[PDB]
Write a protein that binds this ligand. Structure first.
Ligand SMILES: CC(=O)N[C@@H]1[C@@H](O)[C@H](O)[C@@H](CO)O[C@@H]1O
Ligand SMILES: CC(=O)N[C@@H]1[C@@H](O)[C@H](O)[C@@H](CO)O[C@@H]1O
Ligand SMILES: CC(=O)N[C@@H]1[C@@H](O)[C@H](O)[C@@H](CO)O[C@@H]1O
Ligand SMILES: CC(=O)N[C@@H]1[C@@H](O)[C@H](O)[C@@H](CO)O[C@@H]1O
Ligand SMILES: CC(=O)N[C@@H]1[C@@H](O)[C@H](O)[C@@H](CO)O[C@@H]1O
Ligand SMILES: CC(=O)N[C@@H]1[C@@H](O)[C@H](O)[C@@H](CO)O[C@H]1O
Ligand SMILES: [Cl-]
Ligand SMILES: [Cl-]
Ligand SMILES: [Zn+2]
Ligand SMILES: [Zn+2]
Lengths: 597, 173, 597, 173
């Protein structure tokens, strides 16, 4: 028949074939990840290889269809997703070289290790060696050591590779009709044909940067506070008007200032929102953690966990004997088979984490109706965003009281609202500038705008200008610090984390609005809500099926990314901060350094 | 002689479902009235006895059972087994994960996904000829040619709407 | 010295003297209205005669000042406010007859009593006897009785007097260079010399009728809906297409449909916005009610009540023994002496009233800065409007919770909201037509477009036509139903209620805008909003010193009044009504009647 | 001999204010330090002691007390009692509703509302001549002729700024 009609039939045949290969592959991936056997790591490949090799075969066949000559959004969507020419647009030499790079970088990072200069006997791997230093050490020089070792070894190493990586990856992008690789990535946010719901690879940067402006005041203060705080922690090493020594930031990069809480706590007298002990004091097992989580979702209107979930999930470490990987993940294998892998400890951070993960699972369930190629979050940001909303409503003292882990006598006083909001901003708000800047550099580095002989001289041109952070020791183009951060030297889009962060704060607002919630936004608990779930399930049932703009509209009532709600969450902290900073300096001079000359 | 249909060791594929003729028999249906070993049992006729029959057997995916009923949308009901509009008796189903599925993958069960026009109530198609959306002979590898018959893939760890269900459809005239 | 200079000293002399007489007059008037003794009724007159006699003395004396020959707006106003003629423009024989009328009428009304036809022992006085019947009886005939007896006795009586009242009062007006007494009253709204701020006595009618047209759609529905509802209440007595029986409107005239609530409530299963019972169940006294409203004003930035207020006001009927008039009034006796006179019942209707009354008192206070002759609302409508703005914020479910009359848990949803809106309409939207219609008939019976032999014939035409109300029995020209309402037979301008209701929402819009408020106007509560409080005061303190058009432009930005805001406050109820009425005839027939059947 | 001033059974009207000379005395002033019985106590000088004076007595309206200080606007400070610009001691005032006010109305207290020119600091004027804004003799009935001295009218029910306040002004030299 037509070209449209011919296409339906192709996509159809594809689905049913993909479903079988895809499932076989997950089942493989999983078994390996729950049971690290050699025979398993063998099949984890086989199945993943057929899958990937079938994907190619299909993509290149899917190429024989003009989607421009197709007027049925749904079909266009899947067809075009499948029209993933990918690295197959390069010559066989490029494509193999590239994979070697992508791999080599991946390897170096995971395998990298630095050794004690005056005790070369013992070396540390980033995890958990260096990491635990960057997270716990109050020693300026020990912290400096790790920080500088890591970037000077496994950093300088990824430099050469990264340069070539950029070239090879750019050609790939150019050949597929993108301005650059940056343009490629920004692609994820694009929308064509719907009106008002249309969105462009350009209009990302535009929105991203505009949204970020209205974040400076909140951050500048957050900054201002922690600085004074850090001045006491490392007296003499910091300047009241200067940037923050990058190695004094809580982790190997300062991606999150989370670990600064210990020494930036507003009122160290106040006690606990940490039911870590309230759980242990109640003989809570991995079963209760999740059964509870289920109940949560059930309350707002969503379904039980499929019996499959209970029969198939791994919730507690099998210990030794049968060892496994421990990263918490939500598995959507296919053939309506969901499950979670999590080495469940009895931390509140895990009871919370249970929720974030099962958020995912519920999302995975909700869109199982959609055709195979549309089952996934509206964008990279949506899926994590839904994860967090859950984490959020459960962490409220109110919900904890509702459960009965928190003594139904706790007085939620004005000051406890602050230690909470600060421990929050330290993670949620801390990471925003950091995250923006990083993709600001990449984005520019992929448009030649940042010449090779200015890569590092430019990292920190923005590490100071944007983030308010400095290098404790100076770096020339021999270094490649950005590549010492996972996502960078592992080829992952990173802006995802900004839009995610932003998104979630609209979701929560719009849901606490519908959940009819009175007090401050951060005190909100969508449990026992229903009309809230409904408003949520409306965008959960689509995944990639409609433009995110619509999906997002379904829950908030607006077509775009809004920072306002994020700010509302932190408005009570912001006011306090401003007053705190009464006599401290707000802002930073770029020119100051912890090394001088 | 009904327990020689539901209880028979193997079952057909929907694309080639088996009709068993039963005449001059007398049975109680009571063997069926009392059954929690039964996921579905919608009787588009009644639920009484006269001790007088057609028994069509086959296997479908969970979320496919929904189609073994009059006026149902398609794919399974469109190209494999199409119940009649009013005319009816009973549709009976039951999960068989241990019997028809394996943790490793069981793909013995077939079903037809492409065709030229829907089947008439109670029609059958055993054809197995490479298919092109506009008639014409077909010779795969060739493009726009597909084999009409596809495999189910009943893994035991799958979701309920993805597990094997044996279905028996009784008819009265 | 000049001519203007001579004037300055004259007015100064006036102030110091007037304040001394005006006060003794008010203190007399008070002691009477709170204690109806015979020695009291005496001095009430005396001081009030010395006052009015001194005013006359002064008026003719002010007459000797050319205000045309004066260029200081402030002075011109007061001088010319004093260049008044009043009823002194008539002859002695008329000016006594008139006062005798005005007194006879006033008396008849307050002393009227109907007695049970089949029981000439018991009699009831309008308040609280008839009134209670009209506000509570579900009995068609009992309500028919009251309604008809009142108009039959105390009505047929006022008839002659009113006819003469019309004459002598017309003369009074004409002799003062007015068209009729109607023109006189429409005088209040006039302004000359300012450009764009000028307003003519005719431009009122024009604006009023115009503005009113835009209310019809909304009122017709209200009507349509309460009709249906009333059909269930009074099965068989109403026509699906006919007007509403006057005796079934919740009070003695239908001035307000407020009491219809109990039997027209949209969602009875919801938790009642009539906190009347909540108040009763919580043992609230008159004290709590007033101390409660004071706190409200305090919260927006206004002052407590003068300790004098609390020692002098009369807040609960002394009962029998020492008898007093009950109409709720807000007294500005002078010499900074304020008080309220109200026989506070523990109703909700009365708690709202407390605020409207206390509203006036705040306005009285706010312009005690002004010279004696300028202490007064911008126009007649302003003071009532200020009262109502208060009455508005206080009656929202939001405020209700804040107070404690509504469960802290209360879940404000679309059904409660319609309940609250439907109620607010019964009062606010209900009077609009009633009041417009009343004043039209009156205005007409002044320009004498209505002859003595149709006086009623025409009134009921306008009830049927404008208000969609019909009289249950026929009324020949012996009747004088308009005078059955205090305001008429007690000689009071009435359009104020209409104009007032418009300003109400105009102010409310801009006040909530000033209070940085969320969404729907009807949901706004200006409590705790110094910003909003402050704004109102800035127009409050201007007394009559400003032309109402300007002062109204200071707050809302409008040379004139506008019906738009009102219409928005009611949009939800408008669209919800529109639906409800889908199975009803909307509108009426001037032809149906319960008597001509 | 202070308790002989504030405690004097009666007090004068502002236009006719009373000056009492106090010399060759010793007083602790602490009779004045130790007082909440005192609504106004501004001392445009000090608040210590030298065990050493002129007391000025008179009555005014609440809202008129704000004029018993230097640099003040008018009417009372203009035509009755003008305190000297810098030159100053203390100004003391206290509410007297129960004493100089009556529910029936109390008008004994006078004040000059008209005049030809401001008083100098500590000036006085007991005059009572019909006033006209352009000099010229006066004889009311006649128009534009007013009597300078008007009555206060102190009612017990009135607002605070309309209640009587006895005021004593101490001066040093
Ligand atoms: C919008 C539209 O064109 N309708 C259909 C859609 O309902 C269906 O799911 C799809 C499957 O091939 O085909 C078309 O897209
Ligand atoms: C300078 C001038 O002419 N202004 C005066 C003002 O002082 C006074 O308060 C008012 C009353 O006479 O009139 C004018 O506004
Ligand atoms: C100063 C003011 O206007 N507020 C006070 C308030 O502080 C006090 O506690 C209350 C008790 O009488 O009365 C007043 O409302
Ligand atoms: C309108 C309203 O809710 N009033 C609140 C009251 O609830 C609260 O006790 C007080 C303390 O912050 O502030 C406000 O006056
Ligand atoms: C009407 C009048 O007397 N004028 C007043 C004057 O008393 C006052 O001092 C000034 C400001 O303080 O405003 C006016 O000009
Ligand atoms: C056979 C076919 O492709 N048509 C279906 C149609 O029955 C359904 O109502 C709608 C949405 O699922 O569109 C198609 O998926
Ligand atoms: Cl870095
Ligand atoms: Cl009437
Ligand atoms: Zn996750
Ligand atoms: Zn009023």
């Amino acid at each position: 028949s037509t070209t449209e009609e011919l296409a339906k039939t192709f996509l159809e045949t594809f689905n049913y074939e993909a479903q079988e290969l895809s499932y076989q592959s997950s089942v493989a991936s999983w078994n390996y990840n729950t049971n690290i056997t050699e025979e398993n790591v063998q099949n984890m490949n086989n199945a993943g290889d057929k899958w990937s090799a079938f994907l190619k075969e299909q993509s290149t066949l899917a190429q024989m269809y003009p989607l421009q000559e197709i007027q049925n959004l749904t079909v266009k969507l899947q067809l075009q997703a499948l029209q993933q020419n990918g690295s197959s647009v390069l010559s066989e030499d490029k494509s193999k070289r590239l994979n070697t790079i992508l791999n080599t970088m991946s390897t170096i990072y995971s395998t990298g290790k630095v050794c004690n200069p005056d005790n070369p006997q013992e070396c540390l791997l980033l995890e958990p060696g260096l990491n635990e230093i960057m997270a716990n050490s109050l020693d300026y020089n020990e912290r400096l050591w790790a920080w500088e070792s890591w970037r000077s070894e496994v950093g300088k190493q990824l430099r050469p590779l990264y340069e070539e990586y950029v070239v090879l990856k750019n050609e790939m992008a150019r050949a597929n009709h993108y301005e650059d690789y940056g343009d490629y990535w920004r692609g994820d946010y694009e929308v064509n044909g719907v009106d008002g719901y249309d969105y462009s690879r350009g209009q990302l940067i535009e929105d991203v940067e505009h949204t970020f402006e209205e974040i400076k005041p909140l951050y500048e203060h957050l900054h201002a506070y922690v600085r004074a705080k850090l001045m006491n922690a490392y007296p003499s090493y910091i300047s009241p008007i200067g940037c923050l020594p990058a190695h004094l930031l809580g982790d190997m990069w300062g991606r999150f200032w989370t670990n600064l809480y210990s020494l930036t706590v507003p009122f160290g007298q106040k006690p606990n929102i940490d039911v870590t002990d309230a759980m242990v004091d109640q003989a809570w097992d991995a079963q209760r953690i999740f059964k509870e989580a289920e109940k949560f979702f059930v309350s707002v209107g969503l379904p039980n966990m499929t019996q499959g979930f209970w029969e198939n999930s791994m919730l507690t470490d099998p210990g030794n004997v049968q060892k496994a990987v421990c990263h918490p993940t939500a598995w959507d294998l296919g053939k309506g088979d969901f499950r979670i892998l999590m080495c469940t400890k009895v931390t509140m951070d895990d009871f919370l984490t249970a929720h974030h993960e099962m958020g995912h699972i519920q999302y995975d369930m909700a869109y199982a109706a959609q055709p195979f190629l549309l089952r996934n979050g509206a964008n990279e940001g949506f899926h994590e965003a839904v994860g967090e909303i859950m984490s959020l409503s459960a962490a409220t003292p109110k919900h904890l009281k509702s459960i009965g882990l928190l003594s139904p006598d706790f007085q939620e006083d004005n000051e406890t609202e602050i230690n909470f909001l600060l421990k929050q901003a330290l993670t949620i708000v801390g990471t925003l500038p950091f995250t923006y800047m990083l993709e600001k550099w990449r984005w520019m580095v992929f448009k030649g705008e940042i010449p090779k002989d200015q890569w590092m001289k430019k990292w920190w041109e923005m590490k100071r200008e944007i983030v308010g952070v400095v290098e404790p020791v100076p770096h020339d183009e021999t270094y490649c610090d950005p590549a010492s951060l996972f996502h960078v030297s592992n080829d992952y889009s990173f802006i995802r984390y900004y839009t995610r962060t932003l998104y979630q704060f609209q979701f929560q607002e719009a849901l606490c609005q519908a959940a009819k919630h009175e007090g401050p936004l951060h005190k909100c608990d969508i449990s026992n809500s229903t009309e809230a779930g409904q408003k949520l399930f409306n965008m959960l049932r689509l995944g990639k099926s409609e433009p995110w703009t619509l999906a997002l509209e379904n829950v908030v009532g607006a077509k775009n990314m809004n920072v306002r709600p994020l700010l509302n969450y932190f408005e009570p902290l912001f006011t306090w901060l401003k007053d705190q900073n009464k006599n401290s300096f707000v802002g930073w001079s770029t020119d100051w350094s912890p090394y001088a000359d | 002689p009904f327990g020689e249909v539901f209880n028979a060791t193997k079952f057909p594929s929907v694309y080639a479902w088996e009709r068993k003729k039963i005449s001059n028999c007398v049975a109680d249906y009571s063997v069926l009235y009392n059954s929690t070993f039964f996921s579905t049992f919608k009787c588009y006729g009644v639920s009484a006895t006269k001790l007088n029959v057609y028994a069509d057997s086959f296997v479908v995916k969970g979320d496919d059972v929904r189609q073994i009923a009059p006026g149902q949308t398609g794919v399974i009901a469109d190209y494999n087994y199409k119940l009649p509009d009013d005319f009816m008796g009973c549709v009976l189903a039951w999960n068989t994960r241990n019997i028809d599925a394996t943790s490793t993958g069981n793909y013995n069960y077939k079903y037809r996904y492409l065709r030229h026009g829907k089947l008439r109530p109670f029609e059958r198609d055993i054809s197995n000829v490479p298919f092109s959306p506009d008639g014409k002979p077909c010779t795969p590898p060739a493009l726009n040619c597909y084999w009409p018959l596809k495999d189910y893939g009943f893994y035991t760890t799958s979701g309920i709407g993805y597990q094997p269900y044996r279905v028996v459809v009784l008819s009265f005239e």
